[PDB]
Amino acid sequence: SVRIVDVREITKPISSPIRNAYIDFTKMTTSLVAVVTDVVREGKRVVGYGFNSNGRYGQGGLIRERFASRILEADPKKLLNEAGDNLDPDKVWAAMMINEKPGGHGERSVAVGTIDMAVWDAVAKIAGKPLFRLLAERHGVKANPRVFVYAAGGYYYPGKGLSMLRGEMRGYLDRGYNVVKMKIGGAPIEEDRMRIEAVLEEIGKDAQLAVDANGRFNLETGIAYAKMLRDYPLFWYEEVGDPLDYALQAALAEFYPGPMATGENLFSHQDARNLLRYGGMRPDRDWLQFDCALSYGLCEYQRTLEVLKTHGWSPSRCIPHGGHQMSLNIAAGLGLGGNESYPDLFQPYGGFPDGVRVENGHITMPDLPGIGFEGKSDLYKEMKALAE
Amino acid sequence: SVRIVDVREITKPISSPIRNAYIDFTKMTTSLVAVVTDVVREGKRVVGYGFNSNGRYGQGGLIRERFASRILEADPKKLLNEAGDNLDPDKVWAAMMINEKPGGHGERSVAVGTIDMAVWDAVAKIAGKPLFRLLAERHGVKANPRVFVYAAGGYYYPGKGLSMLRGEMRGYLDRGYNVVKMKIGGAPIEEDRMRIEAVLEEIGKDAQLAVDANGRFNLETGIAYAKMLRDYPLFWYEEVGDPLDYALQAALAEFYPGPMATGENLFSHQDARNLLRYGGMRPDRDWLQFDCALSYGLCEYQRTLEVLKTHGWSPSRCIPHGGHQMSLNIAAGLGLGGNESYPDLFQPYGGFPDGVRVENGHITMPDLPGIGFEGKSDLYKEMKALAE
Ligand SMILES: [Mg+2]
Ligand SMILES: [Mg+2]
Secondary structure (H helix, E strand, C coil), rough: CCEEEEEEEEEEEECCCHHHHHHHHECCCCEEEEEEEEECCCCCCEEEECCCCCCCCCCCCHHHHHHHHHCCCCCCHHHHHCCCECCCCHHHHHHCCCCCCCCCCCHHHHHEEEEEEHHHHHHHHHHEEEHHHHHHHHCCCCCCCCCEEEECCCCCCCCHHHHHHHHHHHHHHHHHCCCEEECCCCCHHHHHHHHHHHHHHHHHHCCCEEEEECCCCCEEEHHHHHHHCCCCCCCEEEEECCCCCHHHHHHHHCCCCEEEEEEECCCCHHHHHHHHHHHCCCCCCCEEEEEEEECCHHHHHHEEEEEEEECCCCCEEEEEEEEHHHHHHHHHHHCCCCCCECCCCCCCCCCCCCCCCCCCCEECCCCEEEEHHHCHHHHHHHHHHHHC | CCCCEEEEEEEEECCCCCEEEEECCCEEEEEEEEEEEEEECCCCCCCEECCCCCCCCCCHHHHHHEEEEEHHCCCCCCCCCCCCCCCCHHHHHHHCCCCCCCCCCCCCCHHHHHHHHHHHHHHHHHHHEEEHHHHHHHHHHHHHHCEEEEEEECCCCCCCHHHHHHHHHHHHHCCCCHHHHHHCCCCCCHHHHHHHHHHHHHHHHCEEEEECCCCCEHHHHHHHHHHHCCCCCCCCECCCCCCCCCHHHHHHCCCCCCCCCECCCCCCCHHHHHHHEEEEEEECEEEECCCCCCHHHHHHHHHHHHHHHHHHCHHHHHHCCCCCHHHHHHHHHCCCEEEEECCCCCCCCCCCCCCCEEEEEEEECCCCECCCCHHHHHHHHHHHHCCC
């Protein structure tokens, strides 16, 4: 017998005075989800866990009312694979998406995405394999435990000066990060320049810098910053203008030869397809940052990957936003370009299993069953507290 | 003194087994919102009301936990107009949109949109004018109370045959409608053709027919139906493919010369801009169906109208989805092409004030303060029950 007995959720606050060009995290929250099954492995009932990335808020309401419900009410015998010995992720996904009209991909995409995370976590556990291994298997490829990761921070903070900004970055390098990212568009262009120069000097030749405007710029501002930014050897210029202003993104290629990135705020394969159709991005050097946790989960992310395939893009151009382990697993199993990471932020949600550290901007995925949340004690404590 | 003292919500059911090509309304709900102020007019405290259109479900959670709070946690003095004698819709809007990241326009767009409806209702009431008159004023134009409306129905219902379909339509004509819309794509193409021929037969020369595929078709299916549909004198072919597959919509122009429509499922001015940029629609004959109630409200709708201007479209090409009075007001005040109406479904959430009747596909807006909900007793009963 294979059945999801319960779907629990709990809203957790991950707010600080932190700020980017678009928002501040004063009221930021996130949803911690648990998919409780009746399957037993190791004399212990298998439970899937998941949570949504920072930035979009928790989705407790949606998870209870529309999705947790549709699963629990579905005929358990219709959510299994051929063998009937495990849950079929796609069948569960389809189950929670019945009676959902097209378009409007936001908020509910976060609820479904976070539930999906837990479903896959459970499935991998039921199969007794690490999610990333199971993924590679399903795709008929060999996984690669080594995953590139970069440290994201450099937020605007009340009373934070060049001194501290510097400290923060150095702190990341001390952790083994060879690539750091930072917020811009939150200060006048010239004050920003000074903040950028301050980090380039601190990291010297031990790391590369990436800047993120959080989609705050209009065309002219984006170009102004481009002219200023292009004189520095930046790793990438992220989300210049509004996530949906594909024309703006395309126009930028004329002023910024260096790699650009965007996509963290596009939550469906349809929206991803539009970016590849109209964004004018360069497939040989730009990065796609779609986050499965906020975009209907891995079941959907697989469709997005198929979209890349139809447009000639390599999955290695993907570096998911979110800084969570689900992405680490997808990256390792399907060959993504890497993953985002938040060393000192939104903890314990995210991070890496206890022990493994960042050596040369990389980490090595330990062979833990499922996503591997159990390996991170401070995070797992929260999860087993929700459901066990 | 102008303080918004409270923002109350309550979820109302609007479910039934009616079905379209994509969804069935088995669990459909909607949010009824009330914006209670401390301003007194007629010895009675002015309260704004609003509710979201059918199809996207209620948003109690979001309204409660994210938007109502912000509006209540704000300085009353910073939400007023220059004179300080009334609320500034845009300031209230900005107030509830703080710390909201770009993209992901779905769900929260419904929450904000429905609260926005109530806010404008209150503002117009505080100003002692009908919302549509106040709108025209603010734009420096003369409002027009004569608004075109069409009857939307023709759903697939268990056990519903050509006989009943016919009856439904005739029922609409009996009430004065000269334009009815039916659902297609929920059955075989030849079965559907029969349904259309029947309806056409029934309405003869007293009305025109519009078909709606609810964005269910892929390119080939869309074209197949186009070849079949084009032989009939239809009013319009609505939402052929996915709301976000602009390329699909564009490819259709080669096979369907007749007017097409779409937009009910795009919920932001950014998404509307993409439709105008890539959808390949014909501005001289197609229709845009953006619904302010599901798209961050009138404050946002005004930006969408600005997008139309930037792309050479007339506001008269707009016929909002939703069948609610907020749209009727925007239509009358800003010169939209008309509004959708559901004479039988989702009542009492929609319709016109008691007494106003449909004459030759048109209704005339009575000069009621605000949106005019008070004029519809069965609806107002529900509203004053929420807050008074
Ligand atoms: Mg970003
Ligand atoms: Mg439609």
